[PDB]
Amino acid sequence: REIITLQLGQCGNQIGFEFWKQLCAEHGISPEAIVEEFATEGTDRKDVFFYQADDEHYIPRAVLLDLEPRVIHSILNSPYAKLYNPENIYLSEHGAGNNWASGFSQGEKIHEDIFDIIDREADGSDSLEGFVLCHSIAGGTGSGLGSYLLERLNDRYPKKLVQTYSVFPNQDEMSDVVVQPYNSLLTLKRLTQNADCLVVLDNTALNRIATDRLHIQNPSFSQINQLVSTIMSASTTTLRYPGYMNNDLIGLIASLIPTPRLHFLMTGYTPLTKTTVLDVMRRLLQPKNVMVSTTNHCYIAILNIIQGEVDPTQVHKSLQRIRERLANFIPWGPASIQVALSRKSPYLPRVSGLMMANHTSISSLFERTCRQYDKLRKREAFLEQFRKEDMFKDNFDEMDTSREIVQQLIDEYHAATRPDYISW
Amino acid sequence: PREIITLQLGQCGNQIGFEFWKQLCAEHGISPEAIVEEFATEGTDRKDVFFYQADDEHYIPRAVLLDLEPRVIHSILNSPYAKLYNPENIYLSEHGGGAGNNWASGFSQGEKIHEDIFDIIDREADGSDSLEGFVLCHSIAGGTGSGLGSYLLERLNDRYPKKLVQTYSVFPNQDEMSDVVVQPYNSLLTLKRLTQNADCLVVLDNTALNRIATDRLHIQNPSFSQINQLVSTIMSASTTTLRYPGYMNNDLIGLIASLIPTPRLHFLMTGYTPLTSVRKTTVLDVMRRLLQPKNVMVSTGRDTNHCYIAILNIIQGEVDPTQVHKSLQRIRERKLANFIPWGPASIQVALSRKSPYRVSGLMMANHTSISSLFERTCRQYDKLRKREAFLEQFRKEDMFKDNFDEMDTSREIVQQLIDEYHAATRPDYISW
Numbered sequence A: 001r002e003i004i005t006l007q008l009g010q011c012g013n014q015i016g017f018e019f020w021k022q023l024c025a026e027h028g029i030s031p032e033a034i035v036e037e038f039a040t041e042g043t044d045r046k047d048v049f050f051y052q053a054d055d056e057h058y059i060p061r062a063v064l065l066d067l068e069p070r071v072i073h074s075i076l077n078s079p080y081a082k083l084y085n086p087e088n089i090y091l092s093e094h095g096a097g098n099n100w101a102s103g104f105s106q107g108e109k110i111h112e113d114i115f116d117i118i119d120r121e122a123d124g125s126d127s128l129e130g131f132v133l134c135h136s137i138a139g140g141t142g143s144g145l146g147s148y149l150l151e152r153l154n155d156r157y158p159k160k161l162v163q164t165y166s167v168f169p170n171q172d173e174m175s176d177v178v179v180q181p182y183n184s185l186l187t188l189k190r191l192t193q194n195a196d197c198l199v200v201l202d203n204t205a206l207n208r209i210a211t212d213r214l215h216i217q218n219p220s221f222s223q224i225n226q227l228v229s230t231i232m233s234a235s236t237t238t239l240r241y242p243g244y245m246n247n248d249l250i251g252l253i254a255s256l257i258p259t260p261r262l263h264f265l266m267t268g269y270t271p272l273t274k275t276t277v278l279d280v281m282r283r284l285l286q287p288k289n290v291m292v293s294t295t296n297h298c299y300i301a302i303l304n305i306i307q308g309e310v311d312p313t314q315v316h317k318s319l320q321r322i323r324e325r326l327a328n329f330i331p332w333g334p335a336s337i338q339v340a341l342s343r344k345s346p347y348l349p350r351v352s353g354l355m356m357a358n359h360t361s362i363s364s365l366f367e368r369t370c371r372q373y374d375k376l377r378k379r380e381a382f383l384e385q386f387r388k389e390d391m392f393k394d395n396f397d398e399m400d401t402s403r404e405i406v407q408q409l410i411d412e413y414h415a416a417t418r419p420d421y422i423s424w
Numbered sequence B: 001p002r003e004i005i006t007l008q009l010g011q012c013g014n015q016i017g018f019e020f021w022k023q024l025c026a027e028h029g030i031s032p033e034a035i036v037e038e039f040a041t042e043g044t045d046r047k048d049v050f051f052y053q054a055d056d057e058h059y060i061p062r063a064v065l066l067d068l069e070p071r072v073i074h075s076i077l078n079s080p081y082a083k084l085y086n087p088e089n090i091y092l093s094e095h096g097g098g099a100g101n102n103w104a105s106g107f108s109q110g111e112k113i114h115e116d117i118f119d120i121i122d123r124e125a126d127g128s129d130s131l132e133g134f135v136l137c138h139s140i141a142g143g144t145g146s147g148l149g150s151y152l153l154e155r156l157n158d159r160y161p162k163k164l165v166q167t168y169s170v171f172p173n174q175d176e177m178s179d180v181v182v183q184p185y186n187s188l189l190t191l192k193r194l195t196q197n198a199d200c201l202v203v204l205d206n207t208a209l210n211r212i213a214t215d216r217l218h219i220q221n222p223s224f225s226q227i228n229q230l231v232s233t234i235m236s237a238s239t240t241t242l243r244y245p246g247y248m249n250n251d252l253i254g255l256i257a258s259l260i261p262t263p264r265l266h267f268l269m270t271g272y273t274p275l276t277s278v279r280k281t282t283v284l285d286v287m288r289r290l291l292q293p294k295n296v297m298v299s300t301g302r303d304t305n306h307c308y309i310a311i312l313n314i315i316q317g318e319v320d321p322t323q324v325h326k327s328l329q330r331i332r333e334r335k336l337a338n339f340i341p342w343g344p345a346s347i348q349v350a351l352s353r354k355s356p357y358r359v360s361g362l363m364m365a366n367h368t369s370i371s372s373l374f375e376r377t378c379r380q381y382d383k384l385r386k387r388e389a390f391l392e393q394f395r396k397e398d399m400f401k402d403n404f405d406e407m408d409t410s411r412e413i414v415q416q417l418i419d420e421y422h423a424a425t426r427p428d429y430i431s432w
């Protein structure tokens, strides 16, 4: 079951690039897309993310879109320039200029060009499972164009799953672009209504990790994106190897998200700074290892992907300790903790783990966005550029509607922490 | 370590329990006297979950056999499997002269033998390095399985409050009038305890098991040993992920959590294929047939908005994960299984190879139509109470001497269960 990856704007294209470089390494594929001599056979399944053009040639099922040339041009001048399908790269002359409404309106104008690439890649798939969107929620392209695409995919491919990797801004990034709470809230509306699973990538927490744990003072996007490609790579493990019948994309979502509307996941990772499976799983629960910055709140579900050689007789003990001890779960159903045992790629130069968690404290992130938006909105601050666009020419009803949809999301999260979430 | 202790009560529980252990011994290469095959590979299974080793190296079922009458337990001790069970785990109390197929008599006798039985249970529990929990084998329509079973469920709740309790509960044949006229009373009183004091209940409907025998094997009035061959096949398959390595999300806790995300709606139905040339049967054939009502061993009536909460399929055969995964993808795409409207479809698959010592499959499912069984018991119980019929032997017992409040409480608790099952079929089950 194929997955098509859509990369939007500076952020989405820059994190997409690291993700595909990482997958190439793992799947024994060269920067030019040619099977490595040592990798003619393997345990891995390339079919999901890569198209097989030849016996020896592999192309990413990836669509690259931006409204500015910079990032796509960097990629086309890199050692990985030949990897991507040149017909899958779209670049618009016309930027989104840090404005959601401009990015969104630009989507409308460039619809047919975008979906000539998407439709072709979809119709070229034997059994398409769904789409992965990589983007920032705070800029102009990843927010506006991303939001346009989410609505369009919902109508054009109603039976396909949409998973996103959505980057939430830093405080430094928030203060630099004053309209970000608007772009963010507007994007959160489509992430709430038009995505099946959203992996929250939080620049605040990612920066904190790079400084406190990796000891990198003043971390660049390149360095931050190393942690990002690690999450994205680790979280697609069960899709990239055979034998995880219960954890194809449909299966992953079902277990992590038994609550359809509460589909925002946070990630944990170890080692960030002799090790057993008990240690790895204990570490994944430590707040300092959790990659979003957020009593009462609880786990809806946990999936630990554990990579490396482990004593599998000890997995029960680790899981059970977590149920009966660090980990607070929903009061209206059983504790849902699952493990997927994996081995590290033999092509790579140790035991590690990724936690994918559905935790209600994620709402505090959306609460913050709502507070920053309210401070601006209730002074009609910085709305002039939005007004110049079609969606906001007459009024800001689209904003008031986004605001209420995100409030309904937040309300459901708090309600999920209580036994009365189910009236029985 | 993740030990499971099995408790077998009454005629039915002991009869199905005995068949279950015969089957486990055969699959794990253990003789009727508990001696493992000479050339057994190490770390190839997880015998330790259901068996322990005696001083002399012979394997012993972690099993407690309880009855208020001698027949079945004496058969087991005159069989070739006489030396299999721990003699200290066999308890027979004949002082009250059996439970007389009456729930009150069985429950009341439980209270009298409490210390003797819990000396046995506590011993097995305390002897476990890391006990997962208990499995009860019994029927609900007799006296010992139902009444003593109900007593033990209440006691386990208080005594081992953190341990899982799973039951394999045999439900009475509804297509026939029984010689036990108090069947509905026995059934409802037990259902109250299965509702409140078990984490998971595997319902084995004699109505459906009989129909298989009558209609497919063409045996008009099948013996218990004929229907128990079906039961042992199902019960042994249903523990496959517990006694073999590589199912880390399907230990007892993980099995229950995935099938029962709704804590109170914890009654499971089972299906199996083949229960009874040209081209080999595929994984797809097996999985498709596990959704056919005739292969599911509860009789719910044919028609509705009843739906699956969860499905597990355990596939046995020499097939590749990708074949099973492609089959699972087609079962989803053909929309054969109707699921809850308030959450995603939950359908899981486990794959296993047949014992060393031909694709087949077991379904374990949480489906809301199970409530129709409880409704039939309520209906039969209501008619009897209105007629004030067959209460004589109940009133002879302490619990029912003054009044029938215990019956009224059971009736309402079971009604609350039924109402939540019907609520589970609606989008508004979650108010968001």
Ligand SMILES: Nc1nc2c(ncn2[C@@H]2O[C@H](COP(=O)(O)OP(=O)(O)O)[C@@H](O)[C@H]2O)c(=O)[nH]1
Residues within 6 Å of the ligand: A008, A009, A010, A011, A012, A014, A015, A096, A098, A136, A137, A138, A139, A140, A141, A142, A143, A167, A168, A169, A170, A173, A174, A203, A221, A222, A224, A225, A228
């Ligand atoms: N983690 C990460 N975040 C980024 C990157 N580039 C941009 N961002 C985030 O996205 C925001 C600006 O979005 P940008 O991608 O430049 O706008 P866009 O091109 O219109 O999507 C910044 O304020 C950061 O929050 C990147 O390479 N990595």
Ligand SMILES: Nc1nc2c(ncn2[C@@H]2O[C@H](COP(=O)(O)OP(=O)(O)O)[C@@H](O)[C@H]2O)c(=O)[nH]1
Residues within 6 Å of the ligand: B009, B010, B011, B012, B013, B015, B016, B099, B100, B101, B102, B139, B140, B141, B142, B143, B144, B145, B146, B170, B171, B172, B173, B206, B224, B225, B227, B228, B231
């Ligand atoms: N499937 C099955 N059902 C049984 C067996 N023995 C009795 N039953 C059923 O169990 C109920 C009566 O319970 P029974 O175990 O005989 O009475 P108890 O000894 O007092 O617990 C009725 O529904 C019988 O049809 C058996 O070996 N197999």
